[PDB]
With several copies, the nearest count.
Chain A
């Protein structure tokens, strides 16, 4: 092939041009996103039962849906919550690789058939089935700054005038409203109701009759009497449209002929569908849109389009309304793309500068330089072909491969230059001889590298999906690299390279290059002198090697493992949890204190605080809240003190003082989903008839025992909520029956007044909206209020609720959990420092085996994807190592010589380990991939040293040592060239701070440490490996 193209430079250019056009086209059309899809597909079923307690939700909705989730394919497991905000969420998680659309339609179809088994009011609200994402592209806040709109006003404006146009915008896949459109709110007054012998039942009945769509028919409809001249639709009753019309709804006609109107017993207004959340943005009422990216869409294009759409809405905003962007991943992602492009470009520059320092003429430095953009372009094309995106993982995959992808054309060119200077042969003949020396090795190397990286594509679940991004990126670049070096670079060498006279090593030159050349010629003799002495004394070096191997193991065992570096993404979270039963107003006071802190003490860092009272992550309710903090641009936050980790630590420290509330700040996970790192996720399961109380006792027993092993377990805790006081009211059936009061009137009176009730729909300015009846707040606050609600008996008399009921306090759950259809309690925790998660899970199972009869357990989430997707690592590494050996044995036609190459592995790894340890970094995916690429290149360096040595022994009859010294002499320069360019090109990532520097540091330091020791140690040790292996066999 290199032969073929040596005599066909135009053909070689054509292949290069096609590759570049393909890449150019691919770069234009490639999706851009922060991260690709990594979590297994999950579908969530959501339902609402206004005014329902957790038990009611569970036993009339959740269990019924769960019992119907049969005959669905590829389900891994199912979980649910039922809570006292009247809400259920069932989440079904499918095998990685499952078609998310098929998963969802199978779920939704099984649900459809369970709908007739659900309560009427639940069928009314509807049950949502949706794909579960945890990432937003951005969150658009909408605020009112002149105090003329409540959050309900704003939410309704956004729904009516903003949401749909955003949902229609190019690239947006889904839009969620933070709030609701208006509902017609009827706020009832029990005193007025009783005054006219009316109940909420009469209110509901009247609304259903006087707010309705009534079918009529046609004038002159078919079949007509013939001769009919006119055909016209008849319009009869249509829905009410306004609060005034609702106020005029007729309830009663008294005996004096006077009329009771709805507005006589109720206050009537447009309001929210729900009042559980209070949202504020720097203290001002807020709503917003949570926006997700459509599949295959370009995040940067979508954000730009979203902003354009919003701007064309701006002119029609009511006064005081303002758009605000508390969360937007796009600027962060912009920084990433540019940085990596910067890195790729200066890599191209460094190859130029390095090859020019050594080769000292434009044409020679041009040849290895040109190959790089061609390889990069080809790689994008292949990525596009495999349907990958431009994302954080694939972009860093490329810079992790810079050393490998850049090395091929450097090796080809350097060797042709060396051949000319050493034999005097013309460019073309030299290129032929040169390619003869390296082509098989370069192709074998390609096979070896494939064996190293491809198995990494075959992990399962979430980590498999992450590694795959690197694996395909790296193998592609590596593959394109050899192809380009075997097709284009030799054509260019044979045609573009200036001839070199035999013996000409530039030592006669003037100025810098002359000095450099003499310096580097003498350094090479010094180098071979050392290797000479080293090979006179290989025993001690086998000892020094074992020392390195031992040290590697030591550092490795003690390097703490994580997944992906935290970043300063310009935002972070603050959790607020007040004691159980704390009211919405109490939580608002804390949130106000929180917000006020950030806006004064961190006034130079904080852009805004978005306070959401009523929202939690592991349980909603009036006693929980969240403060989402948005910071100023990174450029305005110089130094570590003004970065999220610091800010957060400071905040968490300050909020320690706050009295009856747990308040703490924290950075966002890199990938919103996955592990807490050394964390586990455990389900305690009721396997028999046990019930909530016995399950709680078993949980407390498990927790107490866990706490007794700080050495192994740390922070093991319930994910859910504790039982709380609740108000048990018993209706006396006999007394109701004796008073002639029906149980339906009693129960809709209680529920409608105290829980609220969705009656029907009305039309507000062309949009259909809900009508809710409920007691005005001051008549549903306290137990004494119960007796102020009257029900009408059959005989006309009004009977106070107190006449036929009795009440008592008791405890019950505000949030009931289930797992795979059984009652459950999720428990979170982590391995103690120094311990593995595998170890910590093993103890948990042991402790769990001692629980009361009928109590079982299971692993879910991150843990499930380890007890299954962690049994793989061993066998994949084994396949890698076996195939590497076999490729080498084929290359060298030898079962033993492959060992002299495989021995290089620890040489790069020790340096990576030392760097990460010293810098206080972790064993993360970037560290690990960097290990692989560092190993890959050093293996390659050794493969060519050994190839050259063996060739000299085989074809020139040279001695073992003589051949080894010659080889090592010839491999020194090309090895220094690649190492120099790569080590320099990676330096910026090592030291960078701010936006995305977490990942940059993670790939940078491991690579730079690994490359330093790999290049410094290998040029002395592989000579040893080759000599010792040969002697032994």
Chain B
């Protein structure tokens, strides 16, 4: 952990675009992580700061960094309904089928929160409709347990 790495973790989370910009110009570690293994990209994805996601990725951030429980920024973006961030991540090589420690995928999380547009995008980029989490569930299982009829149809 570095001085500027910490500042970047904070600025990325806070969505302070200009501070991120200046930090990028000063060489702040884009691969810094906190105790739970979240990188600046994890944070920007979680909190939905689109422009910082993009700046970070232009600046060599690991698009497929995972935290200490196996979760990637695409997991976060998909789970919290950040549609454009999800597109940018996948466009930059994010693993559409990344499994966290629970065998949970971005499709699972998006389906669970009923983010229909994000589900379609993930399917577009080749998300595995049949992947099962540790309990043997799929996105489809989630949709009918949730009683989400629209989503159930998409997953067919």
Which residues of A approach B to under 8 Å, CB–CB?
A: 579, 581, 660, 700, 725, 732, 734-735, 783, 806-809, 811
> Are A809 and B69 interface neighbours, CB within 8 A?
yes
Among B46, B101, B104, B134, which residue has its beta carbon within 8 angstroms of that of A811? B46
If A725-B35, A808-B100, A811-B46 touch, does A783 touch B135 (CB 8 Å cutoff)? no
| A735 surroundings in chain B (CB, below 8 A) | 135
> Are A725 and B38 interface neighbours, CB within 8 A?
yes
A-B contact pairs, 8 of them (CB 8 A): A579-B6, A581-B35, A700-B14, A732-B135, A783-B69, A806-B133, A806-B134, A809-B36
The 4 A-B pairs of least Cβ separation, nearest first, read A806-B102, A809-B36, A725-B36, A732-B135
Q: A659's closest neighbor in chain B, by CB?
A: B3
Q: Is B34 an interface residue (CB 8 A)?
A: yes
Could you tell me the distance in whole angstroms from the C-beta of B74 to the nearest C-beta in chain A?
14
Given contacts A660-B6, A783-B68, A807-B69, 6 further A-B contacts (CB under 8 A): A735-B135, A807-B101, A808-B102, A808-B104, A809-B68, A809-B69
Q: List CB contacts (< 8 Å) of B1-19 with chain A.
A: 6, 14
Among A579, A700, A806, which residue has its beta carbon within 8 angstroms of that of B104? A806
> Are B69 and A734 interface neighbours, CB within 8 A?
no
If A700-B14, A783-B68, A783-B69 touch, does A807 touch B102 (CB 8 Å cutoff)? yes
| A732 surroundings in chain B (CB, below 8 A) | 135
Among B34, B69, B134, B135, which residue has its beta carbon within 8 angstroms of that of A808? B69
Which residues of B approach A to under 8 Å, CB–CB?
A: 6, 14, 34-36, 38, 46, 67-69, 71, 100-102, 104, 133-135
> Are B135 and A725 interface neighbours, CB within 8 A?
no
| A808 surroundings in chain B (CB, below 8 A) | 69, 71, 100, 102, 104
| A807 surroundings in chain B (CB, below 8 A) | 69, 101-102
| A579 surroundings in chain B (CB, below 8 A) | 6
If A725-B35, A725-B36, A725-B38 touch, does A809 touch B67 (CB 8 Å cutoff)? yes
| B101 surroundings in chain A (CB, below 8 A) | 807
If A783-B69, A807-B69, A809-B67 touch, does A734 touch B135 (CB 8 Å cutoff)? yes
Q: B37's closest neighbor in chain A, by CB?
A: A809
Among A579, A700, A734, A806, max chain B CB count under 10 A is at A806
| A734 surroundings in chain B (CB, below 8 A) | 135
> Are A809 and B102 interface neighbours, CB within 8 A?
no
Could you tell me the distance in whole angstroms from the C-beta of B19 to the nearest C-beta in chain A?
12
If A734-B135, A735-B135, A806-B102 touch, does A725 touch B69 (CB 8 Å cutoff)? no
> Are A725 and B71 interface neighbours, CB within 8 A?
no
| A700 surroundings in chain B (CB, below 8 A) | 14
| B135 surroundings in chain A (CB, below 8 A) | 732, 734-735, 806
Q: A734's closest neighbor in chain B, by CB?
A: B135
Could you tell me the distance in whole angstroms from the C-beta of A727 to the nearest C-beta in chain B?
8
| B134 surroundings in chain A (CB, below 8 A) | 806
Q: B15's closest neighbor in chain A, by CB?
A: A700
Among A725, A732, A734, A809, max chain B CB count under 10 A is at A809
Q: A735's closest neighbor in chain B, by CB?
A: B135
| B67 surroundings in chain A (CB, below 8 A) | 809
Could you tell me the distance in whole angstroms from the C-beta of B145 to the nearest C-beta in chain A?
9
| A806 surroundings in chain B (CB, below 8 A) | 102, 104, 133-135
| B36 surroundings in chain A (CB, below 8 A) | 725, 809
| B102 surroundings in chain A (CB, below 8 A) | 806-808
> Are A725 and B68 interface neighbours, CB within 8 A?
no
| B6 surroundings in chain A (CB, below 8 A) | 579, 660
Could you tell me the distance in whole angstroms from the C-beta of B154 to the nearest C-beta in chain A?
23
Q: B75's closest neighbor in chain A, by CB?
A: A808
| B14 surroundings in chain A (CB, below 8 A) | 700
Could you tell me the distance in whole angstroms from the C-beta of A785 to the nearest C-beta in chain B?
13
| B133 surroundings in chain A (CB, below 8 A) | 806
Among A660, A725, A735, max chain B CB count under 10 A is at A725
Q: A807's closest neighbor in chain B, by CB?
A: B69
Could you tell me the distance in whole angstroms from the C-beta of A728 to the nearest C-beta in chain B?
10
Q: A732's closest neighbor in chain B, by CB?
A: B135
Could you tell me the distance in whole angstroms from the C-beta of B105 to the nearest C-beta in chain A?
12
If A700-B14, A732-B135 touch, does A809 touch B38 (CB 8 Å cutoff)? yes
Could you tell me the distance in whole angstroms from the C-beta of B35 to the nearest C-beta in chain A?
6
Could you tell me the distance in whole angstroms from the C-beta of B13 to the nearest C-beta in chain A?
9
Could you tell me the distance in whole angstroms from the C-beta of A746 to the nearest C-beta in chain B?
15
> Are A725 and B100 interface neighbours, CB within 8 A?
no
| B104 surroundings in chain A (CB, below 8 A) | 806, 808
| B34 surroundings in chain A (CB, below 8 A) | 581, 725
Among B14, B38, B134, max chain A CB count under 10 A is at B134
Q: B103's closest neighbor in chain A, by CB?
A: A806
| A581 surroundings in chain B (CB, below 8 A) | 34-35
Q: A806's closest neighbor in chain B, by CB?
A: B102
| A809 surroundings in chain B (CB, below 8 A) | 36, 38, 67-69, 71
Q: B1's closest neighbor in chain A, by CB?
A: A660
Could you tell me the distance in whole angstroms from the C-beta of B32 to the nearest C-beta in chain A?
13
Q: B104's closest neighbor in chain A, by CB?
A: A806
Q: A804's closest neighbor in chain B, by CB?
A: B135
Q: B100's closest neighbor in chain A, by CB?
A: A808
Could you tell me the distance in whole angstroms from the C-beta of A587 to the nearest C-beta in chain B?
15
| A725 surroundings in chain B (CB, below 8 A) | 34-36, 38
Could you tell me the distance in whole angstroms from the C-beta of B34 to the nearest C-beta in chain A?
7
Q: A583's closest neighbor in chain B, by CB?
A: B35
Q: A809's closest neighbor in chain B, by CB?
A: B36
| B46 surroundings in chain A (CB, below 8 A) | 811
| B38 surroundings in chain A (CB, below 8 A) | 725, 809
Could you tell me the distance in whole angstroms from the C-beta of B45 to the nearest C-beta in chain A?
12
Could you tell me the distance in whole angstroms from the C-beta of B16 to the nearest C-beta in chain A?
9
Could you tell me the distance in whole angstroms from the C-beta of B23 to the nearest C-beta in chain A?
17
Q: A726's closest neighbor in chain B, by CB?
A: B36
Could you tell me the distance in whole angstroms from the C-beta of B15 to the nearest C-beta in chain A?
9
Could you tell me the distance in whole angstroms from the C-beta of B134 to the nearest C-beta in chain A?
6
- How far is B67's CA from A74's CA once the two chains are assembled, in angstroms? 52
Could you tell me the distance in whole angstroms from the C-beta of A782 to the nearest C-beta in chain B?
9
Could you tell me the distance in whole angstroms from the C-beta of B113 to the nearest C-beta in chain A?
13
Q: A723's closest neighbor in chain B, by CB?
A: B13
Could you tell me the distance in whole angstroms from the C-beta of A656 to the nearest C-beta in chain B?
15
Q: A728's closest neighbor in chain B, by CB?
A: B69
| A783 surroundings in chain B (CB, below 8 A) | 68-69
Q: A738's closest neighbor in chain B, by CB?
A: B135
Q: A802's closest neighbor in chain B, by CB?
A: B134
Q: B80's closest neighbor in chain A, by CB?
A: A810
Among B36, B46, B68, B134, max chain A CB count under 10 A is at B36
Q: A803's closest neighbor in chain B, by CB?
A: B134
